[PDB]
């Protein structure tokens with residue numbers, strides 16, 4: 317594998333022609349009005365969400381990636397290929413590390429690293445893992461999780477799925493209540509998928525829904541000089557050993573591979589395109605143990 | 608049935624010496640702090656709700672019932688005993704009418720009246736009847752429902768059950784969003800059940816939980832000269848025929864009922880169990 321910087325920069329420029337990444341990265345205070353009704357990228361149009369004073373107060377003033385530049389970036393997907401890879405040190409050497417869905421690192425650092433500079437966060441995490449912040453203990457656990465992120469960007473897409481609606485108020489209220497107590501940089505993308513979908517539709521990838529991993533690639537393209545991908549491997553066997561693999565690296569040993577998404581996604585089609593991109597030197601896809 | 612004003616005035620005085628009704632009626636802006644953690648009267652202590660700026664902004668400045676005095680009050684429970692009663696006109700002749708849980712009147716006026724001066728509102732009503740205000744149509748329907756109340760009090764107990772927590776944020780955000788567009792007067796009781804329970808504990812009624820109906824009686828005792836109860840009949844069978852009756856007219860309560868029946872017999876209050884006409 318040898319990086320082709322020219323072709324990567326061309327890709328960047330092509331992405332930027334279709335998606336204003338710096339802007340799309342997050343709503344800002346001055347781009348929303350109090351009382352504005354948002355709709356959801358992936359739900360029926362009837363679902364709405366009214367922007368409150370408090371929601372607006374958590375938006376950044378300027379794009380958190382404006383005038384930011386990182387030389388080597390790691391984008392870490394969640395594939396079971398990472399278990400046993402020992403990629404953690406190599407991942408953490410990156411200038412900037414992107415992670416998906418608040419993925420755990422604690423038990424897994426040797427394989428996936430501990431550096432996090434951005435992690436994505438669907439609001440429904442609060443429902444699944446923090447009991448809607450109903451108790452003192454829930455609130456404390458969520459607070460600690462956030463504190464461990466230090467100054468990283470928490471990239472919260474509250475306008476993709478309508479089922480985010482009522483949990484988003486809880487999350488907004490939690491952050492307003494704790495204003496100034498955490499260093500996490502909040503980012504809140506708006507209705508961006510139609511713009512992102514345009515670039516990838518031209519590359520002959522058009523599922524109903526693009527994966528978080530490729531969305532992160534798209535964002536990374538604008539601010540990273542060189543992108544190294546880890547944990548992109550949507551298959552139940554290891555490419556080198558042929559052994560069974562789980563879907564996620566944090567799945568217990570012996571978990572059988574079963575696909576998270578059907579119909580809505582085309583992870584194999586994503587992977588194939590990224591693999592082609594690897595071959596063209598646009599990005600480095602890692603599929604084996606790290607030295 | 609004949610009112611015993613003497614004994615009623617004695618009851619009022621006893622209730623007031625155990626429960627500060629005017630204060631307990633609603634939290635006020637200055638009685639909470641932003642960031643204060645509320646607990647729930649009927650849930651485990653571990654459940655909390657943080658008071659926001661916005662929640663506080665919806666509290667009244669002063670108890671809405673301070674220095675209010677009404678002559679005849681109706682407290683209207685939701686029993687199916689009201690179906691066919693034709694009590695609407697008699698209920699609406701009251702000076703002040705208390706209703707429970709935002710109960711519908713329009714299709715049932717002949718039996719239950721259309722006068723409303725206070726109605727209670729469990730936040731979970733948004734979940735059951737207004738789809739968490741997720742769509743435009745839901746928001747419009749809830750707005751129209753609130754507008755029909757005009758200047759009545761909407762008495763919202765958000766701190767009895769922890770299952771109110773998440774819907775309460777939706778309700779708060781809806782009211783902030785619509786600030787100044789409705790005339791409804793909001794009231795928000797806090798942790799009052801242990802204080803209300805004290806009076807009723809001495810009357811040998813001590814469930815787990817007092818019902819909204821008897822909570823409304825209690826409040827009424829402070830601002831009414833005479834209280835007439837309707838729709839209190841916690842049984843699935845008609846008192847006279849024993850044929851099935853629904854629970855609600857718009858479809859330990861028996862101990863409460865027994866006490867209210869005894870109170871009727873003492874002339875404290877009038878419990879209507881039959882047709883008005």
Ligand SMILES: *[C@@H]1O[C@H](CO)[C@@H](O[C@@H]2O[C@H](CO)[C@@H](O[C@@H]3O[C@H](CO)[C@@H](O)[C@H](O)[C@@H]3O)[C@H](O)[C@H]2NC(C)=O)[C@H](O)[C@H]1NC(C)=O
Pocket residue numbers: 334335336337339340341342343505506507508511
């Ligand atoms: C995500 O980025 C896209 C662009 O990739 C943003 O869409 C763009 O929004 C701007 C609004 O400033 C549009 O500019 C306007 O163009 C018209 C001419 O077509 C001009 O008359 C106006 O004065 C203005 O310059 C631009 O057209 C539009 N591009 C597309 C393809 O729709 C989008 O706003 C971003 N979304 C978020 C939530 O950040």
Ligand SMILES: *[C@@H]1O[C@H](CO[C@@H]2O[C@@H](C)[C@@H](O)[C@@H](O)[C@@H]2O)[C@@H](O[C@@H]2O[C@H](CO)[C@@H](O)[C@H](O)[C@H]2NC(C)=O)[C@H](O)[C@H]1NC(C)=O
Pocket residue numbers: 387388
């Ligand atoms: C930005 O990074 C490039 C590339 O760095 C190399 O590849 C990375 C994946 C990682 O393994 C690095 O340690 C490698 O050095 C840098 O370009 C290299 O610069 C070094 C040190 O001066 C030089 O010896 C190499 O020949 C260069 N390699 C290439 C491919 O150009 C570049 O210097 C970095 N710039 C900054 C400001 O950090």
Ligand SMILES: *[C@@H]1O[C@H](CO)[C@@H](O[C@@H]2O[C@H](CO)[C@@H](O)[C@H](O)[C@H]2NC(C)=O)[C@H](O)[C@H]1NC(C)=O
Pocket residue numbers: 320322323
């Ligand atoms: C880096 O990638 C670019 C773009 O794909 C390569 O440039 C192409 O080179 C082939 C050689 O036959 C031509 O057919 C294309 O038309 C070229 N395109 C452009 C824009 O130059 C380049 O060869 C790659 N570099 C390396 C070192 O492999």
Ligand SMILES: *[C@@H]1O[C@H](CO)[C@@H](O[C@@H]2O[C@H](CO)[C@@H](O)[C@H](O)[C@H]2NC(C)=O)[C@H](O)[C@H]1NC(C)=O
Pocket residue numbers: 411412413430431432433466468
């Ligand atoms: C990316 O995030 C990591 C934390 O994951 C940052 O690295 C830490 O930086 C602090 C403050 O300088 C150090 O004291 C820690 O020792 C570092 N931790 C690790 C795990 O490396 C890093 O600075 C961030 N990079 C950015 C924002 O470019």
Ligand SMILES: *[C@@H]1O[C@H](CO)[C@@H](O[C@@H]2O[C@H](CO)[C@@H](O)[C@H](O)[C@H]2NC(C)=O)[C@H](O)[C@H]1NC(C)=O
Pocket residue numbers: 625626627628630631632633634796797798799802
């Ligand atoms: C409801 O009214 C009661 C009094 O009937 C209030 O109880 C008093 O509260 C103060 C302040 O906490 C205590 O110091 C007193 O000891 C309490 N008195 C009694 C008799 O218990 C209560 O605070 C009111 N609650 C609300 C929410 O309004």
Ligand SMILES: *[C@@H]1O[C@H](CO)[C@@H](O[C@@H]2O[C@H](CO)[C@@H](O)[C@H](O)[C@H]2NC(C)=O)[C@H](O)[C@H]1NC(C)=O
Pocket residue numbers: 677699702703704721722723724757
């Ligand atoms: C109690 O509530 C009723 C409304 O349900 C009030 O009666 C209305 O008063 C307005 C203004 O005078 C009239 O235009 C309406 O026609 C009345 N409606 C009905 C159904 O009577 C009543 O004034 C309130 N009483 C108190 C004491 O506040």
Ligand SMILES: Nc1ccn([C@@H]2O[C@H](COP(=O)(O)OP(=O)(O)O)[C@@H](O)[C@H]2O)c(=O)n1
Pocket residue numbers: 392393394395396416417527528529530547548549550551562563564576583587
């Ligand atoms: N077996 C897997 C699992 C995830 N992935 C990638 O890793 C990302 C993070 O995984 P996830 O399961 O948490 O992601 P989503 O369900 O949000 O897409 C995905 O969006 C994919 O791009 C993969 O390539 N192979």
Ligand SMILES: Nc1ccn([C@@H]2O[C@H](COP(=O)(O)OP(=O)(O)O)[C@@H](O)[C@H]2O)c(=O)n1
Pocket residue numbers: 683684685686687707708818819820821838839840841842853854855860864
């Ligand atoms: N069949 C019934 C229904 C309601 N009720 C009373 O009417 C009140 C209002 O009814 P509800 O069922 O809407 O009230 P909750 O107690 O459920 O808040 C109850 O609290 C009871 O005091 C009754 O006595 N008999």
Ligand SMILES: *[C@@H]1O[C@H](CO)[C@@H](O)[C@H](O)[C@H]1NC(C)=O
Pocket residue numbers: 611613614873874
């Ligand atoms: C009114 O109630 C009091 C208190 O129990 C009683 O002594 C009095 O005789 C009652 N009057 C009636 C039933 O007329």
Ligand SMILES: *[C@@H]1O[C@H](CO)[C@@H](O)[C@H](O)[C@H]1NC(C)=O
Pocket residue numbers: 678679
């Ligand atoms: C209260 O209601 C009674 C009974 O209808 C009535 O006769 C009386 O005049 C009313 N007013 C006052 C001030 O008591």
